[PDB]
Design a protein around this ligand. Structure first.
Ligand SMILES: [Cl-]
Ligand SMILES: [Cl-]
Lengths: 205, 215
């Protein structure tokens, strides 16, 4: 029952280099390949111990049989290197690590501002939400009414803005008669900045 | 080098059978592997050496490979098999190569988006920025155009959007589009208009407000 355990997430400055590790649970018989996935993009082979010429140079791939650990160093990082980095055992690839998030950015840790998206003043159903804006790094979690309200909730995937900071919207559809009677609270957590916010969302005058 | 081709997406009705193809020159001579990736998880090997499944992968997933095409077949597609699927081979000269991936989309009837427009909050305006949000809720299929208009000026490059995954209950998508403007620019114009085009509306639907009137 072999499993591959990868090293923690990392935020890296442009120009720097990242060392990702991959520890197995007899790994002296199999080969380990490194595969990357930029956000929203395909799987892409990097190398194994052999390099894809797209990365010949920038990549260093090593193994320590002693500790059955595989290593991947990627140097002179750009934004375009922002990706999840997976290790896998070759057969095909059958056993996969869970993946290492590498975020290449100049941005500093920042908690979001939480703005209401107030339900339109004008039966049927009203939409309302929170804009969770200008945070770094990923992720933030959002819930509604401390987890009591799940029906009709949509929490969009985060978007990286030109500023190098993320923002996302959470929205919920609710009955129009419940406006001003039901309290609607979005619960926002950004652990990296220790920012927790419960924000009441209310009809404008 | 060596290249693997796949269609971007396949649509199948629940209970019905999905076929995902993987194009390559003499791919018939290689051991084709298939990986399923659900969103925010690692890929899972479902089919190896063309047609073999590992233990614990349902009967529904079978593979086939000859000439310049190999095929992953998924029978009795349930909502649970909404995923990206990647074919992959070991080339003598290119080592390991992945196809571009195919998204499996569950097919349902057309649904028109319900459209909502949110002005910048007074809180945001105090902090020197304006975000105008356009919500397209519970629509099918995925394809949608949002055009932003400010005092009838069509807005180009200053908006971003993201889409949820297919809901596992109703199979719909929701999309939010954010128009970014400086506070000084937001206060120079009156009419903020989000225009939605979709297969489910015979004519496109506009949601508008006028800055500083009850919206
Ligand atoms: Cl239809
Ligand atoms: Cl912008």
């Amino acid at each position: 029952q072999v499993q591959l355990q990868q090293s923690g997430a990392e935020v890296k400055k442009p120009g720097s280099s990242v060392k990702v590790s991959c520890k197995a649970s007899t790994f002296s018989t199999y080969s380990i390949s490194w595969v990357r996935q930029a956000p929203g993009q395909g799987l892409e082979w990097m190398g194994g111990i052999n390099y894809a010429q797209k990365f010949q140079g920038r990549v260093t791939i090593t193994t320590d049989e002693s500790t059955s650990t595989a290593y991947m160093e990627l140097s002179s990082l750009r934004s375009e290197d922002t990706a999840v980095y997976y290790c896998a055992r070759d057969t095909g690839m059958d056993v996969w690590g869970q993946g290492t998030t590498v975020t290449v950015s100049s941005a500093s840790t920042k908690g979001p501002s939480v703005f209401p998206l107030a339900p339109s003043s004008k039966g049927g159903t009203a939409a309302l939400g929170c804009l969770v804006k200008d945070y770094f790094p990923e992720p933030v979690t959002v819930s509604w009414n401390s987890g009591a309200l799940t029906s009709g909730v949509h929490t969009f995937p985060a978007v990286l803005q030109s500023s190098g900071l993320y923002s996302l919207s959470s929205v919920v559809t609710v009955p129009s008669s419940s406006l001003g009677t039901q309290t609607y609270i979005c619960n926002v957590n950004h652990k990296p900045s220790n920012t927790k916010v419960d924000k009441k969302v209310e009809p404008k005058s | 080098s060596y290249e693997l081709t796949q269609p971007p997406s396949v649509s199948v009705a629940p209970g019905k059978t999905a076929r995902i193809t993987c194009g390559g020159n003499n791919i018939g001579s290689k051991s084709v592997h298939w990986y399923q990736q659900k969103p925010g998880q690692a890929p899972v090997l479902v089919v190896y050496d063309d047609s073999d499944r590992p233990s614990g992968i349902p009967e529904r997933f079978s593979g086939s490979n000859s000439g310049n095409t190999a095929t992953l077949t998924i029978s009795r597609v349930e909502a649970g098999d909404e995923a990206d699927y990647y074919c992959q081979v070991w080339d003598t000269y290119s080592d390991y190569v992945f196809g571009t991936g195919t998204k499996v989309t569950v097919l349902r009837t057309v649904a028109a988006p319900s459209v909502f427009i949110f002005p910048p909050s007074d809180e945001q305006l105090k902090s020197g920025t304006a975000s105008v949000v356009c919500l397209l809720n519970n629509f099918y299929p995925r394809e949608a155009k949002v055009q932003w208009k400010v005092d009838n000026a069509l807005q180009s490059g200053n908006s971003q959007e993201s889409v949820t995954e297919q809901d596992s209950k109703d199979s719909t998508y929701s999309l939010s589009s954010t128009l970014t403007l400086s506070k000084a620019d937001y206060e120079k114009h009156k009419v903020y208009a989000c225009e939605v085009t979709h297969q489910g509306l015979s004519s496109p639907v506009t949601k508008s407000f006028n800055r500083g009137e009850c919206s």
